[PDB]
């Protein structure tokens, strides 16, 4: 009687949704056709006899990815008319997907959301995935969040956004729409998790020893993180954690809800079994700055609160004996007004392996969600990138001619300045 | 969906199209009789982009062929793949322009253009979702440079929101085949900047240089130059007809490569290009593709790109390859050449990946970069124009058909203003 609905918008969102939906189907024993040859209820729904239907909706204005989905092996799984598709792409223009073509599509998505919500009885909250540096992704994510915040109100929404890397970039105009989308979801999303690609590339290179990774390898790691986060809702555990038990433990103030994640262990089968993978060493590896899932240095800032999930055969006393060691270290310092900052969850189900993938099978794993003061650097560098081109009003004509006003750029800049001032104000000791 | 129609004018444009359509048909496995004989399923999924469907199962291009004399279209019909073109789309006059811009734009081109506009309107009104138009014509001829540019304005007046492409061959002073080239080049550039959403300049001199130095073949002919131009043309829209990691339609390139609405004159290049005797020596790798892609001699224009700074750049990779390598190589090509990239817009290179390579090749790259080095072509064109105009040479031919010298003065002034304001941003600093 506990449910959650995941929203996938944009090319990156759909490509990570595919990645998480192989993993969930594999973890619950459901074949790609949707047929089994009481834990499924969190992500799926029973049709009365036979197949299961995911509680997910796919959105995009550009039809190529959806058409690829509707012809692959998973054509029989998803309901045919929840893969909403458009005709014309926003083409990396934020104003297009927020003012011009997204408005005519958003009504169908909201109707689908209502039709899925009326089925659930214990709706925990929503999940949303969107790559920020694109037109349709950021614009439609903003519009959907704004509609949901007023249609439903206090229901919790979680956002797994992928911000651009510090120096590596695929587009040339992504700072503009990244800043605008951050403006939009700052006052509209309860949790936002950092996911830039460069850090995960470094993780793959160093640990998985892959020298030529593709997007699928990144999306599989993200899917594993999602599964670790939501395992506690569908498996028995000695110390459970619910989604609603987050803003009471990781969010000191309503404005501050951007945090960065990490995962451990990450290791290949060729050298995994030569070492014992004790809980102490994995919880040490999880706190290593080089294993952050976002390219930010935690040594440059304080910690505010750490929520970290275990799964497997871990015993609570071993967890406490390792939290003490971390509190001992002099290179990790917490904020003054937080004496204890750890929330611990323990689950019994070990992580599942996907055949043909990178990760091996292990009995212990740890996933941490940590809120730290050091996150302000990404905001500062994105702001610096934005200012350089906004000084000469470059690329603005592509946005003014799509219905957006001239002054809309300035207030996003002011909100980022306010956020940066707030992060500095919080981190000073009393 | 999101398909485009083909319109070509003049002899040069007709010869370019006669190879462009052959290349497209060979790519999609269409026999010269209009019957599909392809091998892969993907060859038919997005065939509606360029081809229409008729009874009997054969396919017909949605191309419109126009000229002021019937010889070139009477000759292209007898060539290979000449039967695909619908006979109804052939429109021609009985007089010709004689390389006189005034005759092809005021007296003769004005009366004929109604018939071709009728079929153009028939083609555009019918199609599922319009993406836009692409135009091939030469600036060195009268009928082409007149009728094509007037048709550009007529199309823009009726479809202001669609996108417009123009592949324009400008007369180089090295290989000159017509004495009145500067007049109709300068007159055409005046109208082309006001209406074309994108423009791509191509020079015969650069094509001869490439054929002589990179391919090292003894006797270049127009068939080789046409083949290179056709490969470059096909490379731009490849990801719109095939799946890929990061699809990017023409509008997305328009957003990311044009900073200001009047700076839309690009120069392109295709890689790899190797001689017959050295095609076995080389190994196709991403570094090998990217080192040839930014090579100065590889540009399809005689303009020297290390005489200026790139405002932005784009690359459309083809084939199956890792994205991490592409991003790191793009970063490396931008760190080692920081002097040739403008500094007030960071991360000014766009990348895209398409999983379907060209037939016969495992990897290919199409490069489209907006650089400040293009000023040199307009400088020399205007220099020749002002050297010839000061004596009023050959002016009576133009002035005898209702044109005056005031339109020459305005065209020269606007072209010089374009030259000045294009380099204005080269010296701009942050």
């Amino acid at each position: 009687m506990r449910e959650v609905i995941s929203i996938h918008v944009g090319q990156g969102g759909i490509q990570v949704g595919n990645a998480c939906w192989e993993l969930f189907c594999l973890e619950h024993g459901i074949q790609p056709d949707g047929q089994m040859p009481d834990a499924f209820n969190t992500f799926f729904s029973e049709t009365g006899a036979g197949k299961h239907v995911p509680r997910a909706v796919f959105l995009d204005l550009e039809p190529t990815v959806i058409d690829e989905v509707r012809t692959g092996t998973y054509r029989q799984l998803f309901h045919p008319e929840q893969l909403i598709s458009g005709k014309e792409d926003a083409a990396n223009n934020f104003a297009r997907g927020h003012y011009t073509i997204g408005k005519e599509i958003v009504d169908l998505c909201l109707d689908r959301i209502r039709k899925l919500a009326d089925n659930c009885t214990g709706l925990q909250g929503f999940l949303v995935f969107n790559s920020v540096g694109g037109g349709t992704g950021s614009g439609l994510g903003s519009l959907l969040l704004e509609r949901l915040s007023v249609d439903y109100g206090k229901k919790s929404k979680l956002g797994f956004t992928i911000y651009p890397s510090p120096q590596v970039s695929t587009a040339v105009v992504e700072p503009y729409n990244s800043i605008l989308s951050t403006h939009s979801l700052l006052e509209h999303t309860d949790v936002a998790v950092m996911l830039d690609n460069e850090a995960i590339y470094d993780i793959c290179r160093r640990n998985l020893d892959i020298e030529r990774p593709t997007y699928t390898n990144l999306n599989r790691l993200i899917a594993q993180v999602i599964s670790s986060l939501t395992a506690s809702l569908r498996f028995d555990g000695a110390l459970n954690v619910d989604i609603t038990e987050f803003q009471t433990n990781l969010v000191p103030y309503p404005r501050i809800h951007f945090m960065l994640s990490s995962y451990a262990p990450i290791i290949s089968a060729e050298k995994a079994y030569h070492e014992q993978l004790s809980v102490a060493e994995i919880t040490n590896s999880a706190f290593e700055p080089a294993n952050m899932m976002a390219k930010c240095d935690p040594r440059h800032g304080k910690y505010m609160a750490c929520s970290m999930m275990y799964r497997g055969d871990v015993v609570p006393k071993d967890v406490n004996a390792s939290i003490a060691t971390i509190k001992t270290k002099r290179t990790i310092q917490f904020v003054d007004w937080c004496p204890t900052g750890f929330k611990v969850g323990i689950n019994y189900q070990p992580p599942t392996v996907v055949p043909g993938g990178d990760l091996a099978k292990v009995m212990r794993a740890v996933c941490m969600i940590s809120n730290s003061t050091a996150i302000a650097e990404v905001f500062s560098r994105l702001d610096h990138k934005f200012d350089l081109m906004y000084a000469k009003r470059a690329f603005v004509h592509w946005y003014v001619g799509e219905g957006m006003e001239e002054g809309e750029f300035s207030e996003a800049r002011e909100d980022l300045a306010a956020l940066e001032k707030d992060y500095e104000e919080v981190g000073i000791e009393t | 969906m999101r398909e485009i129609v083909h319109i070509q004018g003049g002899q040069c444009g007709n010869q370019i199209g006669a190879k462009f359509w052959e290349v497209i048909s060979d790519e999609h496995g269409i026999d010269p009789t209009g019957t599909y004989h392809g091998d892969s399923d993907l060859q038919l999924e997005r065939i509606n982009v360029y081809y229409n469907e008729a009874t009997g199962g054969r396919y017909v291009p949605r191309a419109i062929l126009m000229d002021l004399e019937p010889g070139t279209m009477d000759s292209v019909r007898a060539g290979p793949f000449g039967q695909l073109f619908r006979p109804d789309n052939f429109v021609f006059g009985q007089t010709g322009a004689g390389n006189n811009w005034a005759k092809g734009h005021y007296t003769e081109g004005a009366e004929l253009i109604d018939s071709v506009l009728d079929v153009v309107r028939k083609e555009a009104e019918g199609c599922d979702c319009l993406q836009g138009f692409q135009i091939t014509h030469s600036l060195g001829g009268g009928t082409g440079s007149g009728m094509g540019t007037l048709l550009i304005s007529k199309v823009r007046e009726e479809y202001p929101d669609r996108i417009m492409e123009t592949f324009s061959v400008v007369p180089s002073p090295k290989v000159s085949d017509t004495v009145v080239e500067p007049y109709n080049a300068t007159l055409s550039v005046h109208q082309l900047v006001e209406n074309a959403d994108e423009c791509m300049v191509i020079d015969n001199e650069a094509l001869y240089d490439i054929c002589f130095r990179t391919l090292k073949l003894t006797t270049p002919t127009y068939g080789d130059l046409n083949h290179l131009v056709s490969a470059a043309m096909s490379g731009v829209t490849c990801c719109l007809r095939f799946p890929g990691q990061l699809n990017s339609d023409l509008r997305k390139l328009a957003v990311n490569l044009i900073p200001f609405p009047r700076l839309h004159f690009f120069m392109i290049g295709f890689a790899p290009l190797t001689s017959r005797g050295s095609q076995q020596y080389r190994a196709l790798t991403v570094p090998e593709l990217t080192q040839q892609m930014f090579d100065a001699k590889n540009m399809m224009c005689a303009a020297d790109p290390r005489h200026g700074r790139y405002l932005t750049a784009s690359a459309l990779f083809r084939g199956r390859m890792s994205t991490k390598e592409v991003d790191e190589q793009m970063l490396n090509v931008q760190n080692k050449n920081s002097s040739y990239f403008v500094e007030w817009i960071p991360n000014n290179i766009k990348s895209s990946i398409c999983d379907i390579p060209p037939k016969g090749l495992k990897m290919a790259v199409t490069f489209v970069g907006n650089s400040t080095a293009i000023q040199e072509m307009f400088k020399r064109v205007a220099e020749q124009f002002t050297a010839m105009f000061r004596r009023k040479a050959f002016l009576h031919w133009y002035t005898g058909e209702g044109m005056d010298e005031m339109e020459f003065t305005e065209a020269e002034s606007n072209m010089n203003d374009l030259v000045s304001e294009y380099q204005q941003y080269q010296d701009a600093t942050a």
């Binding site: 009003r393 004509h397 003014v400 001619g401 | 202001p160």
Partner: peptide, 12 residues
Amino acid sequence: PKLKTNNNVEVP
């Protein structure tokens, strides 16, 4: 559509 003038003012 709006046009940008040389003084960066967008005029309908």
